[PDB]
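Notebook, student rotation project (T.W.).
Task set for the rotation: take a protein with a known small-molecule partner, predict the structure of the complex, and write up what can be learned from the model alone. Partner molecule chosen: 7ID. Sequence and SMILES entered below by T.W., checked by me.
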Amino acid sequence: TSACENFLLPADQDGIQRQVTIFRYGQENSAPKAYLQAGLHADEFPGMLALKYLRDLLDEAARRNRIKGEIVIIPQANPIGLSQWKDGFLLGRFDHQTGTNFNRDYPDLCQLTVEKLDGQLTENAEHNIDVIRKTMRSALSELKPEQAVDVLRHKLISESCDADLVLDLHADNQAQCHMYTLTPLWPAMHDVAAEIDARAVLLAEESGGHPFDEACSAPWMNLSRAFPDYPIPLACQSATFALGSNDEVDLRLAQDQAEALFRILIRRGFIEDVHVGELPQLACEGTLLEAMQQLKAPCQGLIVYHNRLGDFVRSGDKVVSIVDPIGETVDILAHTDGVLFARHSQTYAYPNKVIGKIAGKEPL
Amino acid sequence: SACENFLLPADQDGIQRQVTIFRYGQENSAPKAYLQAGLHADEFPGMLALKYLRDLLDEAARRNRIKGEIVIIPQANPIGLSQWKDGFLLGRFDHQTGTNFNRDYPDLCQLTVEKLDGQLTENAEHNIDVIRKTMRSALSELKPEQAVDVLRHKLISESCDADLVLDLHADNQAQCHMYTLTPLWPAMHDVAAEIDARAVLLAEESGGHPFDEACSAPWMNLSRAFPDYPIPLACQSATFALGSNDEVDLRLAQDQAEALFRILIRRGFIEDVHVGELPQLACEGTLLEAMQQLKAPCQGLIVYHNRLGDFVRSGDKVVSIVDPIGETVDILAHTDGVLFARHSQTYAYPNKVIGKIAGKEPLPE
Amino acid sequence: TSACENFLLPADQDGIQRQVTIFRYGQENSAPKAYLQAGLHADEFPGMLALKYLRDLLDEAARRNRIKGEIVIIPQANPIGLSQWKDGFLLGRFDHQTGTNFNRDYPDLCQLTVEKLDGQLTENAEHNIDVIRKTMRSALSELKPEQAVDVLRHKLISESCDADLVLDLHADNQAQCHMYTLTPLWPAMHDVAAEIDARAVLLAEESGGHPFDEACSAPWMNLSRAFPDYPIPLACQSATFALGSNDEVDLRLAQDQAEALFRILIRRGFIEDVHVGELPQLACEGTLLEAMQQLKAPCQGLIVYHNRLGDFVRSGDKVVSIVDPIGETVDILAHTDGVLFARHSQTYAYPNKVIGKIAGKEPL
Amino acid sequence: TSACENFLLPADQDGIQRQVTIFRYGQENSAPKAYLQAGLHADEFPGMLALKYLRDLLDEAARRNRIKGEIVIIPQANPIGLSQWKDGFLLGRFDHQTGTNFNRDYPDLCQLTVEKLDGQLTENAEHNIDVIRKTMRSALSELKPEQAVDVLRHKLISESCDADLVLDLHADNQAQCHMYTLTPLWPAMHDVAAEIDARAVLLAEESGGHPFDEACSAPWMNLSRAFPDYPIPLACQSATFALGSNDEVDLRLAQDQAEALFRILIRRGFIEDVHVGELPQLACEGTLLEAMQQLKAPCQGLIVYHNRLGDFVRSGDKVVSIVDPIGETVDILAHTDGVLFARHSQTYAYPNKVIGKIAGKEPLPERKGF
Ligand SMILES: N=C(N)NCCC[C@H](NC(=O)C[C@H](N)C(=O)O)C(=O)O
Ligand SMILES: N=C(N)NCCC[C@H](NC(=O)C[C@H](N)C(=O)O)C(=O)O
Ligand SMILES: N=C(N)NCCC[C@H](NC(=O)C[C@H](N)C(=O)O)C(=O)O
Ligand SMILES: N=C(N)NCCC[C@H](NC(=O)C[C@H](N)C(=O)O)C(=O)O
Ligand SMILES: [Mn+2]
Ligand SMILES: [Mn+2]
Ligand SMILES: [Mn+2]
Ligand SMILES: [Mn+2]
Ligand SMILES: [Zn+2]
Ligand SMILES: [Zn+2]
Ligand SMILES: [Zn+2]
Ligand SMILES: [Zn+2]
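Predicted structure of the complex:
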């Protein structure tokens, strides 16, 4: 019913080897392929519990012989970060050994495949998809990473680059459910945004230092541009789901998110003999990431919020203040109209700390 | 208001920090109160409460209503306050020594009992002044070198001779609760009621010499060392956990500042103010040894089955540890009581304390 | 699995006979009893849409055979006000025929039952509850109202006085979600306030001219005082929910409010086999209604607000100004610290118009 | 600085005499003439506050001696409607005494002047303008209205018919800034539309029952047609500005609208020694009023919108539903491509309630005779 791989990473600075546990629910290399992972930031929990419950649903779908394609589930994509305790707190965002962000510095599969594809593309889009996916797998086989974190990033992209559907499950420090995707995959991924009840959908073609979701979807956009004489569709539809707050561990929520992910899999042809019915109403519009305001602390001090999580705020509104208990108070204003979909869990600032997010429409 | 900026020795980066101390009233006047917050630099509610208590005291000072000496330290630990790692503030342990900021305070009984051998009389007030003077002398003789030892030394040097000491703290996820010396209960019932404690935890001696016990324990221990002399519990100290570490709220901090102000009035620090009827205390004093620490026996997601503040019964499933790629382990209450604390970070390592139940029967654990 | 009653009011001044549509989802006269109504002020809409969607949820609960109690749903409790159009606007707050407020002059069930109860109470609280509820129904049966609005008020209290849970769904002209209840039912109704995300909870033992929620809950408090030798618990837990602004009709909001009401019904033992999970933390403290400041316009003119809805304001702050476009400007100040939970939808004043509300604590 | 008159209406049913306060910033019967009024519908507020701030700007222009013509400002053109409170709400759209709409049943100055002008027109357009304006004033002088609302309409047209520029400031129940003008006055009032940031410009030659803006501009079009052998230019350029939602009272917005109105006055030669500069971007095309779709509720119930104010919608899109909370749901579709520039503030319907507006380009079959 379910295959299990334990992929072993090379030893860290303490001589410790870690494993990535990967579950597969379908026929290997079959039909449509889905990839779902959680816990790439090891201190972001909601996705971990949601995929535990999605597995319970898929075990039943497997027993009933209703799995159509290949579904790949990784509830804890980052066993390195998961071990990084300091003074009794888990710091799962950055790699101790390299200092790098776990959701950065993924391979650029356009840069790795453009030369190889020069003579292989044709007028048949489906053919180009198979050629590009095969080329991507070959290009990754040629890379030889040495550090556990680079080997981990390599494995995760090697197992996801040829998928039709990729969902990277994340969380923010204090936030409402929200989604990120590639600009041209909107509104294609309207259904997934609606099912997971995103309260913000943030669009970009190219963001920061090569995150996982863009590593999966961007290559199809960049290859389409590299080879404009050939049909290259956006074959891999990836998104990042921030499912809630980092510490939001709740049975009801995880079960509801597992059921939503199951409904997404049904709608996209991974499950048969199950009815989905009407798509839920999406509570927000897609906006550009560059139109999103990061609220930053201009100084150190207590973070005092004047708005609740999810409040609509307008340009000029006082949203948060930094209070020095032995000094001055500094007021921070909204510079755009939008929804305060994120704040922060730790209510003390250092200068340039991002302490909140407003999803607006006008680029900043 | 007087302001002192006490300078700590430079750290490993050659950086010196200051402890900012505010004083209201005349030096050495009448009764003495000491209030500090942020000894654990990641525990915020007390920091904001003392900011607002200062606003109230500035007005009391303008109106010439301060009777004794009130010492306010909103951020008692500027070392911990600088300790950022991967964007998170880790303010509980000192990064040079690895020690807990609220442990390893001096034992002022051990430091004064020899000196006091020939100095005590049948006059209680005399003994209080002699013991306080001896404590100050004993501390003057100590020469700490590490910034954290210098910090602990300064904080006890400025508080040991106070009549009232309130150490303002927080827990990772908790209701307002209080700790004090067993024999100071019910003496400190009024302060517990004003701050709306939902648990009062009593001990004569706890862990490795925390600040509140460093202030009040010496009077109990000297009373026992010299049973032939009147030695009252002259320094009434308590720890207030004012809420969750990250519970920063205007309304709450203003309410806590007003409660602290009312405590100062009741205990004779503020003139020309009537307080009136004491609020109802929501809990009984219980022993710290009757408190259950809920521990994770294994790593995994922390799933709570009880809300913060629920009354739970022995045998109840209160919390589960869930391995998202493994097994689930259920954690049971071993005592009836109030779940006054849980935890903010919902993932465990083995032996992690993930919650606290205030019970009445002492536990053998 | 859902009953429908169409209760006929006597014909009005135009010879029009109107109906109150009542839906019942459970076991008649059994188990726990819940009563939910909306639209008593016929121009307050959010509750009307929320109960439409709560019915969809209860139809499914009924189909799944999960209803434990008797649940009474009245999405439009006031068909009189609902007809009162003038110049294309619906004026649903006052009765055209009598000039009276629709949420005033409800019967006092203490005054109506104290004589009857003198010899019927015992040391058994559950007995007293059944005796008092039976006595209330009898006392109301004996009343003979003639005006459609008196008949309407009579029916609504007759169907709610014996409930364990009563939620009267309202709105304000421009407001945040807020709640009113009987002072001694706080913090008993903390869970209710938390699920609906109230941003103010206003407490009173006795308010104005006998509103519906107090008509339901006050009698238990007043009978407890009338008969202090007997255990009389506050058997009917009533509250008023102002679910937002009068005109705040939104699909997402009404669905979210329907789901919150469903969660309240589950928590209070009306629905089987549903896991709810952790209670949301309440965003406000209970304050006294007597500590609330009404901001009044001292003169006619434009209402210019300086504070946004939901701002925390301090005594002395300029909150709103009245601007005469051909005359003078008058500044209106906060006289208490608290939350500006209400403003107004029509931004022009007449003298003594209430143009906003601040929920304070009445300190000294 | 400015002249101030208080024109007294005859006493109403309660024996109360109401007054219209009129401000004048220029000379008298001078140079170019501008007329700006707000609050004809007394429950439409944004224009009231905008003209308060425009007066502050004009007081300064007057102090600096920079007023070039006659500028007439009426922040509250309708003191009758302004008094009409019921159950704490202001109902300012219809006159209590007559039941008539405050922005309907204005005089037709073509019908009133065609006979008088028969022998008075010549080859000189400027002459014809002065003759027609004098004739209009005489024709109105001859009328004797009795009811307060008829006297009010009479005064407002008497003070505006001879203006070169007329801006009637209005609002809708829930709407984006939009404009109405006479079909042949477009492209010409492009500058006005651009300065106020209209999101729809709606054109008609004849709309409903004789509104104020058409009462001012239509006569020139109709007289041109009555006397085709003479040059009769569209001497009075009128427009209706719906400045926003009825209840949209905001300091920043009113100041921005006052500044835009000031820039319009500069561009059209009312303000001396001030340069405006480059014209702002026009956000929309001029479209016919008969190409505008009115969304109507076919039944009573909750108004549930599926589109935001200002969304672009396409023919076939579900825009709004009417939901009977104890009955059925009815879906309402867009039947044209365009911007949903208006919805409604009160989210409950009666049958045939207009619950929104879409500005399209293709004339719609049902939009005839308004
Ligand atoms: N493709 C993108 N544009 N974004 C990538 C997904 C966003 C994602 N964000 C977080 O993990 C939340 C984090 N606590 C925070 O502070 O934001 C990430 O950085 O991995
Ligand atoms: N034991 C005493 N007599 N004094 C009370 C000390 C308790 C106090 N606890 C805390 O700051 C909360 C901490 N997060 C925790 O997990 O306990 C402290 O360590 O200062
Ligand atoms: N006070 C109570 N006992 N509770 C009843 C809630 C009050 C309730 N208020 C409203 O519908 C809003 C109204 N615009 C206003 O200005 O209040 C009502 O009058 O029925
Ligand atoms: N076409 C013209 N000549 N004039 C158009 C003016 C329209 C203008 N309409 C309104 O105030 C808004 C109204 N709620 C509505 O539904 O339109 C008016 O009546 O004055
Ligand atoms: Mn502040
Ligand atoms: Mn469990
Ligand atoms: Mn003002
Ligand atoms: Mn609908
Ligand atoms: Zn992340
Ligand atoms: Zn602490
Ligand atoms: Zn109401
Ligand atoms: Zn109008």
